[PDB]
Design an enzyme around this catalytic site. Structure first.
Site, PDB file in Angstrom:
ATOM      1  N   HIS A   1      30.021   9.516 -19.188  1.00  0.00           N
ATOM      2  CA  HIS A   1      29.477   8.195 -18.929  1.00  0.00           C
ATOM      3  C   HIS A   1      28.929   7.645 -19.428  1.00  0.00           C
ATOM      4  O   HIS A   1      28.069   6.684 -19.475  1.00  0.00           O
ATOM      5  CB  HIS A   1      29.693   8.408 -17.502  1.00  0.00           C
ATOM      6  CG  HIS A   1      31.135   8.142 -16.326  1.00  0.00           C
ATOM      7  ND1 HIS A   1      31.488   8.882 -15.616  1.00  0.00           N
ATOM      8  CD2 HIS A   1      32.302   7.901 -16.813  1.00  0.00           C
ATOM      9  CE1 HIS A   1      33.013   9.122 -15.531  1.00  0.00           C
ATOM     10  NE2 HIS A   1      33.064   8.060 -16.506  1.00  0.00           N
TER      11      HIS A   1
ATOM     12  N   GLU B   1       1.249  -4.666   9.831  1.00  0.00           N
ATOM     13  CA  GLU B   1       2.710  -5.405   9.071  1.00  0.00           C
ATOM     14  C   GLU B   1       3.797  -3.514   9.160  1.00  0.00           C
ATOM     15  O   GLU B   1       4.233  -4.112  10.066  1.00  0.00           O
ATOM     16  CB  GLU B   1       2.766  -5.161   7.761  1.00  0.00           C
ATOM     17  CG  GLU B   1       4.602  -5.601   7.422  1.00  0.00           C
ATOM     18  CD  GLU B   1       4.731  -7.462   7.997  1.00  0.00           C
ATOM     19  OE1 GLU B   1       3.527  -8.951   7.938  1.00  0.00           O
ATOM     20  OE2 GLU B   1       5.410  -6.880   8.529  1.00  0.00           O
TER      21      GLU B   1
ATOM     22  N   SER C   1      -4.635 -17.665   6.211  1.00  0.00           N
ATOM     23  CA  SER C   1      -3.155 -17.977   6.443  1.00  0.00           C
ATOM     24  C   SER C   1      -2.625 -18.583   7.431  1.00  0.00           C
ATOM     25  O   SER C   1      -3.113 -18.941   8.039  1.00  0.00           O
ATOM     26  CB  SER C   1      -2.361 -16.393   6.489  1.00  0.00           C
ATOM     27  OG  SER C   1      -2.985 -16.061   4.916  1.00  0.00           O
TER      28      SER C   1
ATOM     29  N   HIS D   1       7.688 -10.884   2.638  1.00  0.00           N
ATOM     30  CA  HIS D   1       8.829 -10.213   3.298  1.00  0.00           C
ATOM     31  C   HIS D   1      10.584 -10.236   1.879  1.00  0.00           C
ATOM     32  O   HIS D   1      10.977 -10.941   1.123  1.00  0.00           O
ATOM     33  CB  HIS D   1       9.579 -10.886   4.803  1.00  0.00           C
ATOM     34  CG  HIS D   1       8.552 -10.304   5.628  1.00  0.00           C
ATOM     35  ND1 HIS D   1       8.723  -9.087   6.427  1.00  0.00           N
ATOM     36  CD2 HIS D   1       6.944 -10.886   6.032  1.00  0.00           C
ATOM     37  CE1 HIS D   1       7.746  -9.421   7.135  1.00  0.00           C
ATOM     38  NE2 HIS D   1       6.818 -10.149   7.334  1.00  0.00           N
TER      39      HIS D   1
ATOM     40  N   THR E   1       6.717 -15.274   5.812  1.00  0.00           N
ATOM     41  CA  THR E   1       7.457 -14.444   6.861  1.00  0.00           C
ATOM     42  C   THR E   1       8.372 -14.451   7.087  1.00  0.00           C
ATOM     43  O   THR E   1       9.647 -13.913   7.553  1.00  0.00           O
ATOM     44  CB  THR E   1       7.092 -15.430   7.988  1.00  0.00           C
ATOM     45  OG1 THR E   1       5.469 -16.232   7.814  1.00  0.00           O
ATOM     46  CG2 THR E   1       6.774 -14.865   9.515  1.00  0.00           C
TER      47      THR E   1
HETATM   48  O1  AKG Z   1      -0.971 -12.993   7.393  1.00  0.00           O
HETATM   49  C1  AKG Z   1      -0.687 -13.216   7.243  1.00  0.00           C
HETATM   50  O2  AKG Z   1      -1.009 -13.720   6.435  1.00  0.00           O
HETATM   51  C2  AKG Z   1       1.019 -12.276   7.033  1.00  0.00           C
HETATM   52  C3  AKG Z   1       1.416 -12.842   8.539  1.00  0.00           C
HETATM   53  C4  AKG Z   1       2.745 -11.779   8.835  1.00  0.00           C
HETATM   54  O3  AKG Z   1       3.206 -10.881   8.508  1.00  0.00           O
HETATM   55  C5  AKG Z   1       4.161 -12.542   8.237  1.00  0.00           C
HETATM   56  O4  AKG Z   1       3.797 -13.822   7.458  1.00  0.00           O
HETATM   57  O5  AKG Z   1       5.133 -12.302   8.274  1.00  0.00           O
HETATM   58 ZN    ZN Z   2       5.299 -10.181   7.599  1.00  0.00          ZN
END
Ligand code: AKG
Ligand code: ZN
Ligand code: AKG
Ligand code: NA
Ligand code: NA
Ligand code: ZN
Lengths: 398, 400
Positions: free
Chosen positions: B316, B39, B160, B221, B192
């Protein structure tokens, strides 16, 4: 094509709102902006009167409903600054933060505040058995402050320090007592930064059942939960949230103003975009950044260098949909022109140009050169940082 | 003294102990999958070379993470080679690579030597259809063979779906159930887009925990500030693995930051986190990434930012009622630092360096002190200092 390693589809057993949702304040709440109180606790804050006035004026224009100021008994300068700010004719209400003492309240009322946010100390209330009942009392002298402030026509809120580390028996009993007397608001404070979001939801939801007045929340960010706790507080019925610009405060600070607005925007875009002048947020953060001499973090919500970036290249192929599919925040709603698609890394003027175009700074040929000269003279000292591009552009406006 | 404006003390009814749901909680027993080398490669300013990836991996391994995730070895030839290179270093932790659900991608992954593949399944790779009058979900044949191939080769597998909080639940939960029936080590949930909220995360993961029997991985995220809170609630609900990134670096403003997550988990269980991870390595670990992607550590970064261990001294500090030392949920010694710094007046130049260097356990020689005081002057000459300039000039300095 398919074979016999599937399963029966999981379907649920008409749908509408749950009773809980009715208590939610996510698209109907007030910010109490505390850059000029909690922010004064920031390690590098030293606001003079002029600077406080600019910050107040800009907060008012931005759209916040309340601004909180340092106790006017903290220092003579503080008293004078409070008076000054109460005389500017702001639209938003002006609060001051005070200990629960008669003298503090008199002075607060004299300065012209619209309200006092009071903190009560654990010595100002006791439990006792009285006619066979377990009874919580707010002591005489402390009750007097509430009544005085009410008599002079001013708003009062009462809170307790370190709410998530108190005994619930004491805490809830205190808020019920204060509510019987009658205030505008009670406050919950995670002074220490240890509360978790479900813990927050459960507590506020219970508080909402105990008292009849408004509910204010104050969350520190030591462990990354300040924005999440504000959100869950809102879902549970909290009506007011304390924020600070860039979260500046004691230790790593509190719920950041911009961060909260980013969260609340996703939840209800029309609400937030119409209430607040979002295109003013960069200019509001830069003002504080300049005064407390910090750089805007590269990953700052909305306004950090990287908030509106997509990776272009071999690494974009890690997400399966087009990277532009994942744009929960629209850059135009915040004064920006676009997400920047980054392939190569941009050195020097190329970096300025990109970020300036993104920020809607229509730069001169003359300004382009001043900037380029200044980044060269900066790189001559040490390697550039993504942060430097936003820094050299600080003095420039859309 | 008192008067009759008190009330009935509110007391709960009459013994207290753990609730059933607590038993599912993984808050003091969970694994990090560290994704700085996956990432993090999506970070706007990341361009890691081989040498640099190797250093980040070695430092992560030492630090204590159980897994490191790498860019697909199929993204490019350089990726393939770097993945092979990292798998040959003999790290203690497990090495995963992140791939699309295709045979070619899985073959190459196994060939490089990974311990597991983290797979993302696309929308077109599963159906709903009626078979003998029952509503049925299928993983398609071509996708299913990827799972079996990888399993046949002894490698771990995770599946995923992307953008989990914006999918239909009928589709999503049925997919994970189908996948669990075939048999995998883990399924993954990914926010995501950065829109999930903590209670919503809790609700979804507890449900997923009821649907499947394998491990559960989460990826959050941070567009809206919820990445650390979602990881926490995910852990409370039964998630077993959390994706992080050093300083959160990733696509847009990134994901759950490693350090921030560790700060949160530390408060929940100090002993567990201090023994598992070498917390005093964290500064070095962040600086190594900061140098590579050319950013400054934010002034308010968790644990390691200039102001994380600061109390305001002065008029303060009287704003809080107890002494400022009462509110120190993070112990600076547990992270290699010496103390909270109590700030009254603004330090400048050498003074500021001295303070922060002492806080960081840098034992600076006289020669180094002057080098630094010079460079700090040369900096102020260009523009006003920021408080992040202090950490920046100190970056190439280490504790004894
Ligand atoms: O592979 C995953 O579970 C994450 C992929 C990813 O970086 C995202 O969905 O932001
Ligand atoms: Zn991601
Ligand atoms: O008065 C309040 O509610 C908040 C005081 C405060 O800043 C804190 O508890 O951290
Ligand atoms: Na009520
Ligand atoms: Na189960
Ligand atoms: Zn505070």
């Amino acid at each position: 094509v398919s074979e016999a390693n599937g399963t029966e589809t999981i379907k649920p057993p008409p749908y509408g709102p749950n009773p809980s949702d009715f208590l939610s304040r996510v698209n109907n709440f007030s910010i109490i902006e505390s850059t000029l109180r909690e922010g004064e606790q920031f390690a590098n804050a030293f606001f003079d009167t002029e600077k406080k006035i600019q910050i107040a004026k800009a907060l008012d224009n931005f759209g916040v409903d309340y601004i909180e100021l340092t106790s006017p008994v903290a220092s003579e300068q503080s008293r004078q600054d409070c008076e000054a700010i109460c005389k500017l004719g702001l639209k938003c209400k002006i609060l001051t933060h005070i200990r629960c003492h008669m003298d503090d309240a008199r002075v607060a009322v004299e300065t012209g505040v619209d309200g006092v946010d009071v903190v009560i100390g654990t010595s100002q209330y006791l439990r006792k058995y009285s006619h066979g009942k377990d009874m919580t009392y707010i002591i005489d002298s402390a009750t007097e402050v509430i009544n005085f402030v009410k008599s002079k026509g001013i708003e009062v809120r009462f809170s307790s320090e370190d709410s998530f580390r108190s005994d619930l028996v004491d805490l809830l009993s205190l808020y019920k007592a204060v509510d019987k007397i009658g205030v505008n608001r009670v406050g919950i404070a995670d002074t220490v930064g240890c509360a978790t979001p479900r813990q927050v939801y459960d507590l506020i939801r219970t508080l909402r059942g105990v008292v009849s007045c408004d509910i204010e929340c104050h969350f520190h960010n030591d462990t990354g939960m300040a924005i999440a706790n504000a959100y869950c507080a809102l879902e549970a019925g909290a009506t007011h949230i304390d924020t600070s610009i860039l979260g500046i405060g004691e230790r790593n600070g509190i719920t950041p103003l911009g961060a909260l607005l980013a969260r609340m925007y996703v939840t209800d875009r029309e609400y937030i975009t119409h209430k607040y002048k979002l295109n003013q947020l960069r200019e509001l953060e830069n003002l504080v950044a300049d005064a407390v001499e910090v750089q805007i973090p590269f990953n700052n919500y909305i306004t950090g260098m990287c908030a509106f970036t997509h990776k272009a290249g071999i690494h974009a192929k890690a997400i399966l949909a087009n990277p532009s599919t994942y744009e929960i925040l629209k850059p135009e709603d915040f004064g920006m022109s676009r997400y920047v698609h980054v392939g190569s890394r941009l050195t020097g003027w190329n970096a300025i140009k990109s970020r300036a175009e993104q920020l809607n700074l229509h730069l001169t040929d003359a300004q382009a050169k001043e900037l380029t000269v200044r980044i060269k003279k900066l790189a001559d000292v040490r390697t550039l940082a993504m942060d430097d591009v936003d820094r050299v552009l600080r003095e420039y406006h859309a």
